[PDB]
């Protein structure tokens, strides 16, 4: 998949495309409908399936540093867009182009001149152009005879509107199971394992910037995977195997994620590690003794073992290769 | 109007004065009664109307950095004192003088030797001298035959005691209309417009230190005035005209004030700008899309247009020259 | 009393000891039972009474910087351990030794090889060894024929479990009288008096790090003692006399303690000062005038005078030499 | 004078203009030649004289946080531009436009489409468009028959090249006299007076100012100069009028960690200028920074700075060309 | 290769080993002699080659925050060790063990009890146990009949002693050529690419990296080198493959206050490497740091760095011994 | 000895006093002459010997944050004053009083009204009152018949002027021997011991102290000196008594950013002094600061500092005049 930064980077010789436009934060199940429709039409005509997306977040252009939290990083947005069949991602920076542009000139510049689009697929909530006056309905009429437009209703399921907004709310509530439900996969973060405490001490510590969306402080059951690597691994964990883990999300009074991998002793310093969240286990608490702390640690392991045993049975969610022991 | 810092700066040849003493933060309607009485008596005898005030706040002398928030800056206190006819302001720093001094020696030093006072006007809540043992009643008796004293009752109106304390409470509640009511004018702040976001982007951004009193975070209707200047102004705003504005007061997680001037495109970087608050519009909120943000922005403009149309009719409050459009 | 840091520092020629093991934070009344039993048995056999304690807090080894607040500093723990007759304190750093060690090897290494113990005294909540699998019951069986073990029930009094945890809760609630009740003495902090405001201004200002346990923000009645010194004292306070004081505990938005010594004018800059807490007086509040501030200051002095007059009558709590005036 | 941010803010009904393009930092005597040529042309043909300038600095666009120090603020660049008769300033942000543009495209879009220019005036060192490919020459060949191009040599005077660079160099060494000479005026900073060590005059300056680290300042030291209280109806504590240049000894310092300060000791006045906006003009270097160990020593040196200043300023008044119309200066204490 | 933290993590069923002990910072040509001897022995007798190394640095244990800069990270020390055939790394923390231990006790506990060693290999400068009492000699006398001891002289080559110290010295002056020569490879750092001034290429590097102050870096300046995108299935913006060394001009800077940066300008590609892990290999010094006052000047010097780099890298490819198997380098633009 | 903050704190029933006025920073041999004259007079006529001193430093009042470093703290100034028999210290804050006062007014208010002085003793460099107008001479003419004035020349000895300034100079270069000689005692700092790298002795100092940036410290380096545990009933970990001066090698450092540290390696003892107040006396410079790359090297140099210290301290004991009454020092390890 090509990734282009700004309209000028798009090849001039690209002759046909089917295009979808959004922030696409999280690439949730709504987002998947748009991508699915776009990919299929691209295949039909033998053109490229293009996603136009935005970075920085368009909200942060108008209201700096009050951008909504990033459900996925830009890099993961690319990975997800690819896994669903996107051929090219065009990334638009509104501080550089397409802000002052009118609905008419936007379609003309972006969709025709730049992307050579025969098809465009947007959500009903789609807006574009100076002061967001462009709508889905605008787009259908401005594209009359020029290109075909398919406007897709926002995904409603089980009485919940599935959007970036609702995924963020669930995450903020610590309800990762509903977030997972809206995303169509286990919510995850990835990052390098740092030195933590030293070398009840966690299998892995990671830190995330405050723009990263994360589950409420608390303890979750989930899976930890050492991303593909030739680097030596200290201990009895292997790369590319999803290992059962009790996960503590905390706030330095910058958010930390501490992972206790069940039934393994490893030290993951230096490695890049994926943490997938499955279910909530408990709220954060203060500890006043080593005894009390380990007691609670063990109850977390038991509850985690239980939740993940269930998770495995929903195998559309569960990883390919996992490691989960029946007991200690 | 002269401004003197400390007793030693007061001219030795000043032969007669009518004096009022207080913090005078905000110069609210109570404060105006004291100034009014003082100015009138000065005119009667042909003497100078003097305000004795204090900086730093006397509270911060005893309890550093737990001083009450400043309703007005010291500079604005001077401006307000002048606009009401004060001839001289004596500023007392209690870390330098008049702290260890007894009620008797205070009247002797400040009122007689320094100020040559024939009249003194204080509020009923007035205290002075070592450990604030001096009262209004003390002052009348210590001044027997030496100078005349007029003690003015605190202003009570509409079931509210009008004081610096109550103005601060209203501001903190986001109730600027009641604060305006107690002040006798639109509450305002002034300051240089800084670079903000770049060059839905606000007409002006200002920053204030944390000792400055400000309305609760939220959006207010008000008026913005470019203070007199020969500097070129980018855009279609003119100096000295009060322009209709939706005002956002925020906190950097130092307080910011962001102003959206209605129906104008200007950039006010470099200019000194007054922001007058008229009425509350809404609480702060997070935005998750550009669409949602602009929707709400437009409702704020509508509600603001409405509030200011009313404000103009209370013309004792409203500015001399304003700019308010009937619609977009 | 000897203080040894780590097992290697303990003299090799020490031939007999009676040993007690715990964090001992606060040396509360439960802790006193263990020490009492240990001291008595040491006297019986003519051996040394040893306390094994821990630093850093064992909790902070597993969960860095989420250690419980220190009721006493390590230095005060030593002082208290001594005042109750302990002959030697062995301080264990779990980041250096005794973490990976099994229950069996722990008793063998610490109690026998290092300490030459004929008696060991622990609380029922006592744990030891890798993953705290060692218990009081373990210890009795592993010590069969090797040394005698006396396991002491946690102290329950007046429906309250007396522990480090409960002392912290009381302190956090601002309930110093119950904390004092559980400690068996007035809760206190000690520290150098710093420059504060200048040279209603407090008799003394002290600052404490955020790991120090302190009463809730508010005003307390208590006693202030200038620790033994040959340094000149500014004012009419003498060292080693416990002086009546209204005490303000605050938070810089690092905790401060501001002390108003009743009926004295002293300046304690440079001196080391003990602050003992007796009872709660009021919550923190903002002040808006010097008048209001002094009014409240005076009510605090009255209420304090009252509480301390009562305190003196419970003379097991009250200091040897105090200073409390009947009135102003 | 109008100020437009971006080519999209330019009035669309602009039929004719004489344009000059550059960073214009400091508006030095070199820059004035460019502006002069442009204004004199515009004034001739009833058209508007436009300046195309750049904010943020093109270097900061390419090398973030490593741009040269600003000789003037953007606000002052506007004010100086207007003072020399420019009718419009167009501020280009290179992160937003005219960056990936070819020399040919740059001319058509900016100079024709946006500005509708009949004349253009640039420095011989002028480079434009992607990878600075366009030069003073490129401009002449591309513009044929459409608009007259006037290329102007960089100003050399007294064996010294007059550029933003040399001005920065002069300032940096504390040589304000050479900086002023290259600028065609007294170098100055403008700023609100802040609270000092306190209000009101054993020790205290008349005025305290702080400046960000992007602001070009003379080397740390003491200088002779003039302070002017910017126009205001707000009252002044002490015996100073607004809009009069007052003789001052000016101390430029750096903060222990934090930023630069400017402390002004106005000669033969006690006043406290907290609350006001103040212009500080530098005339000549007086001495390097020193450490003080006693109050007497500091007061002694203080009195020497007042004498040195008094003299240097007396010469500056006689050299008339740079001094202010109305001022205040006493021959002796 | 296994990694054990502390003597308690070592498999208890370890019957035979050839051991080498040292900080091993940088794994320079001196260190390789130690590892080589050890591996060649272990490989002979079917036993495991163990490295005993130390983290945190023994100096930081004795003098907190005053340890020498790390030539490589601990992660890279492991990777380099494994690359030379070490089977096990035992990481000793001196705050945790082997500190108050006597020479005699150190041998029995570590070398016999823990590691069950039949061979040991150390440098002539080797010191062990409490107060560094044990020396290369002590080791031989204590180990008699139990294990064979092979003491190896510090590597001298071309009149230069090859040690962590001299490597740090070389790096510090910007002499990467001598550092590489003493290392036996191109000096390198590894790190995630961060966001620059923005995404996508007037000014911007191909890649931006930041490094902590414990990381040894060449003196501030420009260098010729190779950048490699570490293995990944993640897509790459632009025309660059993972696992190919690409020619780059590399700029090493310090931050105004904060830390070190490494900016990579990959020759004849525009790509944006945000999100990837990137290895940057240093070949030769190109120039010292300079200040820029104009966009043209910076682009001019930029083009000169590309030429210098192109040449230096051409020589590095010919000197083959240190260059990478697969790479990308063009003779001209 | 009484301590009064402000003229209003002075007992109103003070009928007679001999007064000396000055900053008195460091209480050096010059200052002792002033105090001696004053005490010897007061002691004669049954009156109190008063010191008028100043806090904050008069320079910091005039030039905030640019006062000279404090040779001693205000606490130590009091203690030193009392040690030389001063009965009362009056601390004047120039932000609060005696600032706008005329020479004539200063005498009447402070010397007569407040202190009721019959004798006064000042240095020839003495200046008092608004704009330092009053000098040593002014004082004599204003005081006639009311109080006897004794002006004392600044102390010159061995071609060296003894002043706060020169003491600061000596300290700054690391020449504690000359500082001590000018002071008439071992220079010292006093402070609570903080936690080091940890508790208890491979590497670790006996004691760690930190000092603010207003505190005068010898140049970074190693020094010979004595450490004394200030009087206490609190237990001491290790084999050290309170109130005994113990031989120590003393390392003075600066923090990477943050502040100064003082680390004390007490000779032939292991003790941990966390929790105690400790006095550290400097005797002689041992060496400049160095960087360490290996544990052996640091221990080697460590042992050399112990030898150098042992010798220098042996000489200091023989020169008796400055050494302490009770001390602890061993001839060899």
Residue numbers in the entry:
A (entry chain A), B (entry chain A), C (entry chain A): 1 to 199, 205 to 258, 264 to 338
D (entry chain B), E (entry chain B), F (entry chain B): 1 to 200, 203 to 260, 264 to 338
From the paper:
The overall structures of F206W, D298E and E301A CaFADSs are quite similar to that of the WT (A chains r.m.s.d. values 0.149, 0.152 and 0.251 Å, superimposing 274, 309 and 317 atoms, respectively). Thus, in the F206W structure, residues 200–204 in chain A and 201–202 in chain B from L1c, as well as residues 259–263 (in chain A) and 261–264 (in chain B) from L4c-FlapII, are not observed. For the F206W variant, the side chain of the introduced tryptophan was refined in slightly different conformations for each of the two molecules of the asymmetric unit. In the WT CaFADS dimer of trimers, K202 and E203 stabilize salt-bridges with E130 and N131 from loop L8n of the neighboring protomer within the trimer, while F206 interacts with F62 of helix α2n. This conservative substitution apparently reduces the amount of oligomeric assemblies able to bind FMN and FAD at the FMNAT site, relative to the WT, an effect that is clearly overcome in the ternary complex.
The FAD synthetase from Corynebacterium ammoniagenes (CaFADS) is a bifunctional enzyme responsible for the synthesis of flavin mononucleotide (FMN) and flavin adenine dinucleotide (FAD) cofactors. The C-terminal module catalyzes FMN synthesis from riboflavin (RF) (riboflavin kinase, RFK), while the N-terminal one transforms FMN into FAD (FMN:adenylyltransferase, FMNAT). Bioinformatic tools for the exploration of macromolecular interfaces predict that CaFADS might stabilize in hexameric assemblies in solution, organized as dimer of trimers.
